[PDB]
């Protein structure tokens, strides 16, 4: 019942987060309406709004320029590192081949080992069994 109630409480918390987001949007709309009402204090205040809009447009243009410069730098870095990756792919393939040959050699030698008829865990278990047997014996 508590797991069911915890699932219900998680659903209710998601609903409450959605309602809090809606309330934040409504509060932002109310603040915008209050600012528009207070802006009334015949175009004297339009100059400040035009200056603010021009500043916002300049900031957006600067952000776009910075993003384009970052994208160009990243593309140049990728084009410069592409030959480095093409050259390191050979070393990676060589390491993979060495790992594979080590795996196959270890597998063949383990087959030989199990063909020689010996197991460490089996011998240890048999020794412990003989130990407890002779223990109760004496």
Partner 1 sequence: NPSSQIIARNEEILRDIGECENEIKTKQMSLKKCQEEVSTIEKDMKEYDSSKLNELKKELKLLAKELEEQESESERKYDLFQNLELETEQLSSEL
Partner 2 sequence: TLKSTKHSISEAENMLEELRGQQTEHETEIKDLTQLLEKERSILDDIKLSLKDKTKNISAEIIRHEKELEPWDLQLQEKESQIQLAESELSLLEETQAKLKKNVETLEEKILAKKTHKQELQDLILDLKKKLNSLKDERSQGEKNFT
Smallest gap from residue 75 Cβ to partner 2 (A): 16
- The position carrying tokens 């987001």 is 21
Site residues for partner 2, window 5-44 (CB under 8 A)? Answer: 44
CA dist 86 to 5, 76, 78, 90, 105, Å?
56, 16, 12, 7, 29
By CB under 8 A, tell whether 121 contacts partner 2. no
Query: What number of CA atoms fall less than 13 Å from residue 5's CA on the CB side?
Result: 2
Alpha carbon distance 62, 70 (integer Å): 12
Q: Count of residues binding partner 2 (CB under 8 A)?
A: 10
Helices (H) and strands (E) in the chain, counts: 3, 0
CB 45 within 8 A of CB 39: yes
Q: Which CB atom, from 36 or from 115, has the smaller least distance to partner 1? A: 36
By CB under 8 A, tell whether 54 contacts partner 2. yes
Burial of 45: CB neighbours in 10 Å, binned 0-12, 13-18, 19+: exposed
By CB under 8 A, tell whether 67 contacts partner 2. no
- In the complex, which residues of this chain contact partner 2 (CB under 8 A)? 44, 47, 51, 54-55, 58, 62, 65-66, 69
Footprint of partner 1 (CB under 8 A): 1-2, 5-6, 8-9, 12-13, 15-16, 19-20, 22-23, 26-27, 29-30, 33-34, 36-40, 42-46, 49-50, 52-54, 56-57, 59-61, 63-64, 67-68, 70-71, 74-75, 77-78, 81-82, 84-85, 87-89, 91-92, 95
């Amino acid at each position: 019942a508590k797991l069911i109630e915890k699932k219900s409480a998680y659903a209710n918390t998601e609903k409450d987060y959605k309602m809090v987001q809606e309330q934040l949007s409504k509060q932002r709309d109310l603040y915008k309406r209050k600012e528009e009402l207070v802006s009334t204090l015949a175009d004297g205040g339009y100059n400040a709004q035009l200056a603010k809009a021009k500043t916002e447009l300049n900031e957006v243009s600067l952000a776009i320029k910075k993003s384009s410069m970052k994208m160009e730098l990243l593309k140049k870095e990728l084009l410069t590192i592409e030959p480095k990756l093409k050259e390191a792919t050979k070393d990676n393939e060589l390491n993979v081949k060495h790992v594979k040959q080590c795996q196959e050699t270890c597998d063949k030698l383990r087959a030989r080992l199990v063909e020689y008829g010996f197991d460490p865990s089996r011998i240890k278990d048999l020794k412990q069994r003989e130990d407890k047997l002779k223990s109760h014996y004496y």
